Write a protein that binds this DNA or RNA. Structure first.
Lengths: 103, 136, 142, 117, 101, 56
RNA sequence: CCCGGCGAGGGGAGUGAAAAAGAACCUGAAACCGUGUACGUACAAGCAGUGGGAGCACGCUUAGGCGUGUGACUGCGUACC
RNA sequence: ACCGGGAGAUAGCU
RNA sequence: GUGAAGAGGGAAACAACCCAGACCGCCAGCUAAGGUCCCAAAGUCAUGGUUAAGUGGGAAACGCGGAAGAUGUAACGGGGCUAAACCAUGCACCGAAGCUGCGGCAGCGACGCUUAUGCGUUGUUGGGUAGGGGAGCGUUCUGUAAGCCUGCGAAGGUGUGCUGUGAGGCAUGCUGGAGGUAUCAGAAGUGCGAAUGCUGACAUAAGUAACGAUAAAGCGGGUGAAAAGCCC
RNA sequence: GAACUCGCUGUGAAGAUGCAGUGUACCCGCGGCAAG
């Protein structure tokens, strides 16, 4: 029961009830988003995507929370040129649970 | 440095001198009379506009007793005040030193920092005229 | 999410038999190296063994084209003084048929502990008969 | 007004050393070499944040080629079939699905073969 | 019951006592005493004295059952050193712990 | 005769692996006095093989 | 009081709020030297790290593949001024 | 020959 | 033109050779130079030709010869290749920090709601030595401050968690057992990694030579716990 | 300065333990020959 869908230019293969990680989405925390774009449907008999974004398939993902990702420090230094600068970064992330995939 | 390969008295050396040791100097600044009087007018205007100022016909104590002054302030519902009057009153000055929160000075003794620090200022019938003619 | 990885203790590896006779030395060596590396399997991973054991039969009767019979030479410098021990291809194949295949396969594989682990899976003999009849090694067609 | 720098220097040294844990002895305790080690590690991480994509793409390419060769088609021909079939599925998804499932990959490869011509 | 005995500012090198100490760690007190008595190194006498003091303290403070004492921990630490012309004399701090369990 | 680099503590520790001593583990009990002693040596009390000696 | 040599030193008892204040006596970090615990290493070549990374021990959502501790192997990587 | 002072002497460079 | 002061990919290594100007993050896709026998990601891909010699994988003038090159083949990067060498014609793939897709930050402009003087759009830029300009963080003291916290635990020390693009900030366990100081302005002995910089401490070299004229000690007893070094 | 301090070929501010290729070597001690 795995389906492939893309949200922020990255494809993800997810099943029903499996949380997935995606880039920042402009959706409410307590609301659900319907991705009309699908790349694969898996079942007793699969439904190959003869053309992109098969209409028969759709994904329903409910947002559970938001927040900042793990801290990552990026430092630039140069060979005996006296260049040195470091800065932190925390990419925004969104975790969404998928409940039911249309065939 | 008291003393006498390099030198022992070099600042880098332990127990040596200081590279840029200072000398006794005075930091007093120059303030224009016009600028000072303008600042005094501005502070007085702000003080009156917020209603920090209290004016009475004559504020004095019959006897040089601090308890009497404390009672007079208590019935007036004022604790931290600056009493500014005209001719210095012997009894008030004598019975005002012990109360740190309360300060008394003559008309010519007004200073900006004193006005800022103290919550309220208590003038007199003649002190208002004295300060008005002083500022000009 | 994490990409799938091959656990060394849960890898399904089988055996195979390759006949060296009638096959070009370089091409068969390359194929054997590819199979040892496990690249053919869909679970390839460059930090864990995933290939299948290979048994080579009749290494002495290997087929090589051109004048490689005499032109080819083998050199190893043990050390000390005058370590210039030459080995002509004919002499080596006559005396040590297995060493040519072993060195070729070792060269085709990486250098390091992983490469040694890959090479240790290969067995080579100079005759059809082999003692590894208990593993049921399916013949390899190529 | 004399000011003592002990607190600031100690805090700086503690903070820099806390990031130099496990560097084979001297690098993990001596500030002089710990600073150089941490700077070099930061540069290496900066390069790795971009080399990771290359490494993972190469691994996916290898896995896809391995899966396709079994079905009887080269990787290049498989990609040609996928592209000519108007399929935008990336290599990462195919590599992920080739190990967990085989029927789906078989369908993809046979479709690629059919659409190649 | 755990008993601890220590000796401070020993007239011996810091590391020359660890060699004797290794023969004590993990060994029963009964055999440890004999091993130290029959050891030849100079620090052997100091280690034996420390162990004897430890067992005496254990038996005096503890009720009874001296025979089941095993040396659990023992170590030697750097001590204050004496500086002279250029020469440095080291000192050793011996620590021993004896406990039935 | 001059070291260009300072050997690390690990190398020094490795070089000191052979300096460990050996336990005697050879205590033999006297036949009569019943006190253990080093083999082939008179006891402190002055006994050996059970036979008596000066034992000053 | 006991060990210790009628020593140095130490362990109990007591005073002391505290002896994690003992005359070497407020606070006591690093360099440096140790014991224990967890993991790796005796077929493995190089500025000693960086990503991937199975494995191994503990606590957690009592699994749900989470964190900490080490890092077999692998691509890359020729110190500071 | 050594001690204190001119002297924190003077030029360039490191 | 490049380096100086531009990262990255390729030419095995390499700064001046080819492609290619790094705002930050993502396990997405398409390309430039160069590659698609393995090492190592990609065609043991197709078509028409040359090569029998490993020339390819080093060489002139000159009648295929000319041809002799470096510890070891060592002038293929290793194997190995008779095509896995070269020429020309194609469809594909790999191929960077180049470009595109998603997300985030900042400068520079422009548009308007015009503001309450910001907001919503909008294109562009974001390598950097010397240098210039702008914006901030850390500590001592002064007034704020006879305020506040604090023996129900201050400063300091030592771990953890959460925080911002940064120097840093807050909470808390333990040790500490008496000071610290909100907000806002002022003065600075104001932020350390090197100057064969200086005081103190701690190391390796290391349990390493030496124990110093090559006049020589042996034994019994005594003191002492301990005696080749003391006394008889 | 830090070290988990091998040989050969090649390049390199020009004889490379550290750069490209390849080969050898179980971990750790003790005594000398001095090519470095």
């Amino acid at each position: 029961m795995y389906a492939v869908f893309q949200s922020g230019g990255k494809q993800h293969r997810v099943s029903e009830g499996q949380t997935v990680r995606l880039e920042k989405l402009d959706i409410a925390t307590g609301e659900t988003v319907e991705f009309a774009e699908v790349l694969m449907i898996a079942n007793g008999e699969e439904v190959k995507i003869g053309v992109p974004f098969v209409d028969g398939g759709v994904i329903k993902a409910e947002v559970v929370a938001h927040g900042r990702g793990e801290k990552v420090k990026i430092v630039k230094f140069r060979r005996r040129k006296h260049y040195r600068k470091q800065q932190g970064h925390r990419q925004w992330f969104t975790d969404v649970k998928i409940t039911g995939i249309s065939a | 440095v008291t003393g006498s390969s390099g030198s022992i008295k070099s600042p880098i050396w332990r127990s040596g001198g200081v590279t840029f040791a200072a000398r006794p100097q005075d930091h007093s600044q120059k303030v224009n009379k016009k600028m000072y009087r303008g600042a005094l007018k501005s502070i007085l205007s702000e003080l009156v506009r917020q209603d920090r100022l209290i004016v009475v016909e004559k504020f004095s104590v019959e006897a040089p007793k601090t308890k009497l002054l404390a009672q007079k302030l208590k019935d007036m519902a004022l604790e931290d005040v600056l009493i500014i009057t005209g001719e210095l009153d012997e009894n008030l000055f004598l019975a005002a030193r012990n109360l740190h929160k309360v300060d008394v000075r003559d008309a010519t003794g007004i200073d900006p920092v004193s006005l800022i620090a103290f919550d309220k200022v208590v003038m007199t019938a003649d002190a208002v005229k004295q300060v008005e003619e002083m500022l000009a | 999410m994490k990409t799938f990885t091959a656990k060394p203790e849960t890898v399904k590896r089988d055996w195979y038999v390759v006949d060296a006779t009638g096959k070009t030395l370089g091409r068969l060596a390359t194929e054997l190296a590819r199979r040892l590396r496990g690249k053919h399997k869909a679970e390839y991973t460059p930090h864990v063994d995933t290939g299948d054991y290979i048994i080579v039969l009749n290494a002495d009767k290997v087929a090589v084209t051109g004048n490689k019979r005499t032109d080819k030479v083998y050199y190893h410098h043990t050390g000390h003084i005058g370590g210039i021990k030459q080995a002509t291809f004919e002499e080596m194949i006559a005396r040590r048929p297995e060493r040519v295949i072993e060195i070729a396969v070792k060269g085709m594989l990486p250098k390091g502990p992983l490469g040694r682990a890959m090479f240790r899976k290969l067995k080579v003999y100079a005759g059809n008969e082999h003692n590894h009849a208990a593993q049921q090694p399916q013949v390899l067609d190529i | 007004a004399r000011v003592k720098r002990g607190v600031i220097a100690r805090a700086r040294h503690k903070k820099i050393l806390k990031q130099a844990k496990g560097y084979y002895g001297a690098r993990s305790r001596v500030y002089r070499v710990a600073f150089q080690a941490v700077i070099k590690a930061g540069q290496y991480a900066y390069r790795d944040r971009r080399q990771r994509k290359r490494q993972f793409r190469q691994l996916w390419i290898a896995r896809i080629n391995a899966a396709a060769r079994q079905n009887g088609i080269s990787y290049s021909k498989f990609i040609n079939g996928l592209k000519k079939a108007s399929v935008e599925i990336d290599r990462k998804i195919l590599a992920d699905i080739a190990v967990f499932d085989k029927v789906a990959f078989t369908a993809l490869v046979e479709k690629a073969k059919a659409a190649l011509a | 019951m755990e008993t601890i005995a220590k000796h401070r500012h020993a007239r011996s090198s810091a590391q020359k006592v660890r060699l004797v100490a290794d023969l004590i760690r993990g060994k029963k007190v009964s055999q440890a005493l004999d091993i130290l008595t029959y050891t030849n190194k100079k620090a052997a006498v100091l280690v034996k004295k420390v162990l004897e003091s430890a067992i005496a303290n254990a038996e005096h403070n503890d009720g009874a059952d001296i025979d089941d004492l095993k040396v659990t921990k023992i170590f030697v630490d750097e001590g204050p050193s004496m500086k002279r012309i250029r020469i440095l004399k080291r000192t050793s701090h011996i620590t021993v712990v004896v406990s039935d369990r | 005769a001059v070291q260009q680099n300072k050997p690390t503590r690990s190398k020094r520790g490795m070089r000191r692996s052979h300096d460990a001593l050996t336990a005697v583990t050879s205590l033999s009990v006297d036949k009569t006095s019943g006190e253990k002693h080093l083999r082939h040596h008179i006891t402190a009390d002055g006994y050996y093989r059970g036979r008596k000696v000066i034992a000053k």
